[PDB]
Design a binder for this molecule. Structure first.
Ligand SMILES: *[C@@H]1O[C@H](CO)[C@@H](O[C@@H]2O[C@H](CO)[C@@H](O)[C@H](O)[C@H]2NC(C)=O)[C@H](O)[C@H]1NC(C)=O
Ligand SMILES: *[C@H]1O[C@H](CO)[C@@H](O[C@@H]2O[C@H](CO)[C@@H](O)[C@H](O)[C@H]2NC(C)=O)[C@H](O)[C@H]1NC(C)=O
Lengths: 165, 55
């Protein structure tokens, strides 16, 4: 198990990855966001269609995580992005999805009203994941190398480690 | 079902690689496939997305 750079924060030149946070996740007081997935915003006032991908040069197996930002209303659609209708599609040897963001009146939680649906699959050692997005999207920065053998579970306990065996 | 024994049917959907192959095979941009039975009730839209090649 180890963390890996798939596509850095730097590589998004056509889209604004810097100020992609909100009043919800405080790092050192100041407003932050999930440090392993980047939230994409329009540049100047136009949102280019993204179309990038990742072949797995690594020989260990890995998994990717991504998601969708669901807005509160059609007014917040045109504030963050410059699109009315949006599509996010992901493609791998196995996977085949086409996700549309849902717009609906919510209730407020931890500040922000709209939701954030995440997704995942495991990418084979010698295969490519392909993305395509019009907007309303949160792309991976980091992803994990997994070598799985055998299963267990999530034990629910209050205790802490006792340096034994 | 004129037959008196019970039966099952199979069908599916072709998902294209891009909007260019949409207009090559078929002459439609948006497409719908709907199936209806006493129980079943579905409306299937083909997903377009960049894939990897297999076979
Ligand atoms: C994933 O990345 C690598 C990029 O090099 C590909 O690996 C080789 O590609 C060659 C040339 O077409 C093929 O003979 C084999 O698939 C690999 N062979 C050797 C000798 O290295 C790989 O095909 C890419 N695959 C996908 C699905 O993206
Ligand atoms: C967004 O704003 C920028 C301003 O910096 C626009 O860029 C300029 O466009 C005008 C009209 O052609 C000219 O001053 C130059 O061609 C560009 N200026 C520079 C400094 O490069 C930009 O056109 C606007 N974006 C869009 C998509 O229209």
């Amino acid at each position: 198990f180890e963390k890996i750079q798939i596509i850095p924060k730097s590589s998004w030149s056509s889209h604004e990855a810097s100020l992609g946070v909100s009043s919800a996740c405080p790092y050192q007081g100041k407003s932050s966001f999930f440090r392993n997935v980047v939230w994409l915003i329009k540049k100047n006032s136009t949102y280019p269609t993204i179309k990038r991908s990742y072949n797995n040069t690594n020989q260990e197996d890995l998994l990717v995580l991504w998601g969708i930002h669901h807005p509160n209303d059609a007014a917040e659609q045109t504030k963050l992005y410059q699109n009315p209708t949006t599509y996010i599609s992901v493609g791998t040897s196995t996977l085949n999805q086409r996700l549309v963001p849902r717009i609906a009146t919510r209730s407020k939680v931890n500040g922000q009203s709209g939701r954030m649906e995440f997704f995942w699959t495991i990418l084979k050692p010698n295969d490519a994941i392909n993305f395509e997005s019009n907007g309303n999207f949160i792309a991976p920065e980091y992803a994990y190398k997994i070598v799985k053998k055998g299963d267990s579970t999530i034990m629910k306990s209050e205790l802490e480690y006792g340096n034994c065996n």
